[PDB]
Design a protein around this ligand. Structure first.
Ligand SMILES: *[C@@H]1O[C@H](CO)[C@@H](O)[C@H](O)[C@H]1NC(C)=O
Ligand SMILES: *[C@@H]1O[C@H](CO)[C@@H](O)[C@H](O)[C@H]1NC(C)=O
Ligand SMILES: *[C@@H]1O[C@H](CO)[C@@H](O)[C@H](O)[C@H]1NC(C)=O
Ligand SMILES: *[C@@H]1O[C@H](CO)[C@@H](O)[C@H](O)[C@H]1NC(C)=O
Ligand SMILES: *[C@@H]1O[C@H](CO)[C@@H](O)[C@H](O)[C@H]1NC(C)=O
Ligand SMILES: *[C@@H]1O[C@H](CO)[C@@H](O)[C@H](O)[C@H]1NC(C)=O
Ligand SMILES: *[C@@H]1O[C@H](CO)[C@@H](O)[C@H](O)[C@H]1NC(C)=O
Lengths: 49, 99, 50, 285
């Protein structure tokens, strides 16, 4: 436990990347998160919305 | 059923095949088609319902006898087992970047 | 069976291949009622009475 | 062939604690060295479950402890039985059990397993019958008075025939069978796991990951079930169909699942080697 800052920087970068990746499986108020299923199983207007 | 009458007094074995939908999940349906195994090429794959695009290499990841899919620490599709033959593939996107 | 003692043939949990019924030359009547016989290969059911 | 058995006293059952058991695979996703955190129906750790007794010793002054009550089915049942002579030999999962609603009959009789789904008129004390002989010394399953009538059935299932041990061996228990019965979205998924054991008392400590076994799409509303035990009617105990029946020696544990978050730990091959909960204690949280 001597090189604390060098490890903490990498840990913060990894956590930021993991959060950015996980932010793709959210609904954000929509029906689902998969775009192809939304555009296939729904009318064009609501799909575009 | 005397074998001397006309064509209107002969046995006619009739079938009354009917179809109906209950609330239970469907267990009898029609057959499905399958294509060839084109690997080492960025194509579109659909094994049992999942989609994606990427090459299908032959990795060495050993799955469990009951497990079918495969993910990583990022919770993304990385390896899917082939339905026909028990061969674990590997899904990786093709080349992409800036010029 | 007889006309007044028609026996049912409830069967499920199978793969119904309808491509053998209308592709034969041994029947006389194939008048389906609103089932799209050529489209039966993409419709799933629960029970098939016979 | 319904028969109300007699000579069975009453006694408050005991409660044995579950030591970190009831962890199964939620899905079929492969993960290697991943500390995934899922939320599903599981068994809370350090929670005591009902201990049903089934024994017949000479010290018992005519008690004949043969317990098989009609237990409810809220969300899941962590069925675990430590048997040594194959006493627990099926289940009578159902909803009403009065010849009005269908009931999932899963019974593995002498030949094979028959997962039948039909409307049956069950008795007030269902059981199986195995008669012992003094001339050729062969245990044969004869009595099968589980139900009394049938009706229009539904999707069933059979298997290839086989032969079990069917012998009253002496000593401590040597087998342990765990099961998890869940019923959601018309899918009665069943988990199973068989591990050896060398204990003669309450459920020992350890950890095991139950794998999915069958996913019969029955689509029923099972909310109350019961157990199917087996007696040892022989030349020793005389009488009739109502009195003069043995009970052997076995025990089965019944638990209840509750929705709670769990933290799983996948190994480098895909098997769960350890897990922790999320509300047993501040350190666990
Ligand atoms: C499907 O058939 C092919 C050949 O027709 C065979 O190689 C393959 O093993 C079969 N799949 C299964 C699961 O038996
Ligand atoms: C057992 O007892 C119940 C209620 O006491 C009764 O309804 C049932 O008929 C009895 N069984 C037989 C076989 O008489
Ligand atoms: C055993 O469980 C019961 C639940 O009905 C309750 O008395 C308590 O949680 C436990 N008691 C003991 C003494 O372990
Ligand atoms: C076990 O059950 C099967 C299926 O109903 C039956 O054919 C067989 O005779 C049964 N065996 C005994 C010993 O009752
Ligand atoms: C064993 O003996 C009993 C007693 O009569 C008899 O019913 C049974 O058929 C015998 N079985 C064999 C395999 O001899
Ligand atoms: C079976 O028969 C009962 C009564 O005749 C009927 O209500 C039910 O719809 C039938 N089919 C089942 C239970 O699948
Ligand atoms: C994982 O699998 C490998 C390959 O057989 C084996 O050598 C290793 O012991 C396994 N790890 C375990 C069982 O913890």
């Amino acid at each position: 436990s001597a090189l604390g800052k060098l490890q903490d920087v990498v840990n913060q970068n990894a956590q930021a990347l993991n959060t950015l990746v996980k932010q793709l499986s959210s609904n954000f108020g929509a029906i689902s998160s998969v775009l192809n299923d939304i555009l296939s199983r729904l009318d064009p207007p609501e799909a575009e919305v | 059923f005397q074998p001397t009458n006309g064509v209107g007094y002969q046995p006619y074995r009739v079938v009354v095949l009917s179809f109906e939908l209950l609330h239970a999940p469907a267990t009898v349906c029609g057959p499905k088609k399958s294509t060839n195994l084109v690997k080492n090429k960025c194509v579109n794959f659909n094994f049992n319902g999942l989609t994606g695009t990427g090459v299908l290499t032959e990795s060495n990841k050993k799955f469990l006898p009951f497990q079918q899919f495969g993910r990583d620490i990022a919770d993304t599709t990385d390896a899917v087992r082939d339905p026909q033959t028990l061969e674990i593939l590997d899904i990786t996107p093709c080349s992409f970047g800036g010029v | 069976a007889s006309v007044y003692a028609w026996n049912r043939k409830r069967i499920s949990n199978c793969v119904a291949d309808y491509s053998v019924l209308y592709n034969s030359a041994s029947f006389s009547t194939f008048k389906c009622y609103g089932v799209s016989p050529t489209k039966l290969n993409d419709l799933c059911f629960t029970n098939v009475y016979a | 062939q319904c028969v109300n058995l007699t000579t069975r006293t009453q006694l408050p059952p005991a409660y044995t604690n579950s030591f970190t058991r009831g962890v199964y695979y939620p899905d079929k996703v492969f993960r290697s060295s991943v500390l995934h955190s899922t939320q599903d129906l599981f068994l809370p750790f350090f929670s005591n479950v009902t201990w049903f007794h089934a024994i017949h010793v000479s010290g018992t002054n005519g008690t004949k402890r043969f317990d098989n009550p009609v237990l409810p089915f809220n969300d899941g049942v962590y069925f675990a039985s430590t048997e040594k002579s194959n006493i627990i030999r099926g289940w009578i999962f159902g909803t009403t059990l009065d010849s009005k609603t269908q009931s999932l009959l899963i019974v593995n009789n002498a030949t094979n397993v028959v997962i039948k789904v039909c409307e049956f008129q069950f008795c007030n004390d269902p059981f199986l019958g195995v008669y012992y002989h003094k001339n050729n010394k062969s245990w044969m399953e004869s009595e099968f008075r589980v139900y009394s009538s049938a009706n229009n059935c539904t999707f069933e299932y059979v298997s290839q025939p086989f032969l079990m041990d069917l012998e009253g061996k002496q000593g401590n228990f040597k087998n342990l069978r765990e099961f998890v019965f869940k019923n959601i979205d018309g899918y009665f998924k069943i988990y199973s796991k068989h591990t050896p054991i060398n204990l003669v008392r309450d459920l020992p400590q350890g950890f095991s990951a139950l794998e999915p076994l069958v996913d019969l799409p029955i689509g029923i509303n099972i909310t109350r079930f019961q157990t199917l035990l087996a007696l040892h009617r022989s030349y020793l105990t005389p009488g009739d169909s109502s009195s003069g029946w043995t009970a052997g020696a076995a025990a089965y544990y019944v638990g209840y699942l509750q929705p709670r978050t769990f933290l799983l730990k996948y190994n480098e091959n895909g098997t769960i080697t350890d897990a922790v909960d999320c509300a047993l204690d501040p350190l666990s949280e």
